[PDB]
Design a protein around this ligand. Structure first.
Ligand code: HEM
Ligand code: HEM
Ligand code: HEM
Ligand code: HEM
Lengths: 146, 141, 141, 146
């Protein structure tokens, strides 16, 4: 996770404008709509059969908020992503059995969501910094797998 | 396979792109070069500075080919045959790279088409770029 | 796309596998779980220890499906329709994992079939496992 | 390189038995045959139209020896692959323009070649250690790309 100071500033700047609750719901919902295979982990969430059923599902929205809340907290610790996400890593592996490739898909969907929300302001250099952060978070969540 | 609804979604979204294709193509490329630097290894003969003319020109060609695939959405492997041969026999770009350009095109469309880039359209577009990538890569070996 | 020579190469190599198909399938799984531990996430209900009977039985199943694909090489999408449906709608395995299993099956064959694993046959098996993988992931979305 | 003592020991002992000349030539040849796209970097080597032409090509054989030689030396620096391959990383990026994804492909071909030669001895645990080394080598070779 080699971030330059100016990259780190770019990441933090934009993130301060993000409504985490709403963005969380969108990113998780889009993941489940664009990559329907990821639905294998959420059968307890009820109806996920159409895009409106997924996007407006209260449990998807609430889970999105929880996921992104932990992600934000991660942005406050860019110098120690691995320690920050250690217990979550173990959980995703030993209890939830989530193939880490899914963290990479979520990262890329999150990046489209940020582009969708911010338009122009999500310039090529800003996207590049976010790509590094999403990859770092995905790697940190995968680090305790065994 | 694209479904009837996917096709409808792609024609609609690309129709709003209209005469911006070239520009969005060049932006997708710049996004790709900056976010995924390994992709530059395929363009050592290009000036890759911001605003570069080679980048603008190449963006147009990529966009024109995507416009052609949209126009022939029910016959893509034949409409893109020539491009498939070029990529397989001359350029020989590793397939992972197609996924990276596809992602960057999606980001570009999201950044410019806020009202059209709904969840359903995002899904159809992702499937559409994946089909295009499969065609361009189908004759490699 | 598989060429005539590829099909010929695959039928011959798989022929020599013969009654060891099941053993090799199990070995390839074991190699995969050890080399690529993220693959274990798909088998939380299995005893994954060395020589476990679930790995053995599953090894046989995979091997037999492969035998059926070799026998039906000209018509894979049809011969494997039910397995394709199973992987797309129930198991929902991320595509990246098919490349990991394929590589492990190659290593297994290389280790047991020295004389038969020539550079041309290696090429053909790799293409065959790739097409099998494509067929099994074609109905995902 | 999170390598275990029993893993480090497994890599080292097997390697003490490798004929680098043969394995190098065989790995590089198989790469060019199994993944024809990689031929894009070797137009000046001559005829590569067929598997027999590739495997017999003396420049392919000699380039293979050179590549595996550098790999061999890296195995004595497992605690510092990045530092060992830094100059080579820069050359592969700045002078040769080689997409690092090819490093991963060569790694896997190599593993198949080791299995082909050592048969029984190339057990599941020994392969697992080599997969880690080949990914480590690929990652270090790609480290200085920009
Ligand atoms: C940014 C990456 C992610 C982060 C930071 C994250 C974080 C979290 C957190 C904080 C929880 C609640 C933990 C608990 O219940 O004790 C959770 C649960 C869960 N996560 Fe992740 N998550 C991420 C990505 C994903 C992905 C991509 C998937 C699958 C596609 C996934 C699947 C799940 C599942 C199935 C649960 C349990 C839900 C339940 O309560 O039934 N996560 N995650
Ligand atoms: C959506 C996928 C893509 C499409 C539709 C596409 C289309 C095209 C087109 C129309 C050309 C111009 C060929 C001509 O002059 O007739 C071209 C050339 C080229 N493409 Fe692809 N391309 C795609 C992806 C990629 C990617 C992923 C790479 C590698 C990063 C790549 C590398 C190249 C290169 C190096 C050239 C030659 C450029 C030059 O020397 O002028 N392409 N492509
Ligand atoms: C060459 C590629 C593969 C083939 C031919 C194949 C074939 C099969 C077969 C025959 C079955 C048994 C279906 C039945 O019970 O009738 C099966 C099930 C299964 N496969 Fe696939 N498979 C392949 C790759 C994969 C990979 C890459 C994964 C994930 C890493 C995977 C995970 C599973 C799982 C979890 C089951 C269910 C196991 C159980 O609960 O008993 N497969 N597959
Ligand atoms: C195990 C990974 C690899 C290692 C350790 C390695 C090592 C080397 C070394 C030591 C050289 C000699 C450079 C010099 O003369 O100073 C070289 C040259 C070269 N390598 Fe790599 N290499 C690897 C993989 C690859 C692959 C995958 C490709 C492309 C498929 C590639 C393409 C080249 C090319 C084109 C040259 C220049 C050959 C010439 O002079 O014509 N290498 N490599």
């Amino acid at each position: 996770m080699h971030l330059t100071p100016e990259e780190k500033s770019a990441v933090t700047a934009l993130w301060g404008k993000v409504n985490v609750d709403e963005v969380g719901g969108e990113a998780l919902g889009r993941l489940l709509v664009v990559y329907p295979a990821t639905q294998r982990f959420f059968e307890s969430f009820g109806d996920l059969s159409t895009p409106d059923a997924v996007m407006g599902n209260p449990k998807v929205k609430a889970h999105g908020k929880k996921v992104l809340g932990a992600f934000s907290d991660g942005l406050a610790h860019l110098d120690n992503l691995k320690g920050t996400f250690a217990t979550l890593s173990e959980l995703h592996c030993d209890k939830l059995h989530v193939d880490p490739e899914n963290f990479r898909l979520l990262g890329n969907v999150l990046v489209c969501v940020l582009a969708h929300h911010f338009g122009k302001e999500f310039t090529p250099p800003v996207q590049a910094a976010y790509q590094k952060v999403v990859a770092g978070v995905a790697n940190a969540l995968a680090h305790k797998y065994h | 396979v694209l479904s009837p609804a996917d096709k409808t979604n792609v024609k609609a979204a690309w129709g709003k792109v209209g005469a911006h294709a070239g520009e969005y193509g060049a932006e997708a490329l710049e996004r790709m070069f900056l976010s995924f630097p390994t992709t530059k290894t395929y363009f050592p003969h290009f000036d890759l500075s911001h605003g570069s003319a080679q980048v603008k020109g190449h963006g147009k060609k990529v966009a024109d080919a995507l416009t052609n695939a949209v126009a022939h959405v029910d016959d893509m492997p034949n409409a893109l045959s020539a491009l498939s041969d070029l990529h397989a026999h001359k350029l020989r770009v590793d397939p992972v790279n197609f996924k990276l350009l596809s992602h960057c095109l999606l980001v570009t469309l999201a950044a410019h088409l806020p009202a059209e880039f709904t969840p359903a359209v995002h899904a159809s577009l992702d499937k559409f770029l994946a089909s295009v990538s499969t065609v361009l890569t189908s004759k490699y070996r």
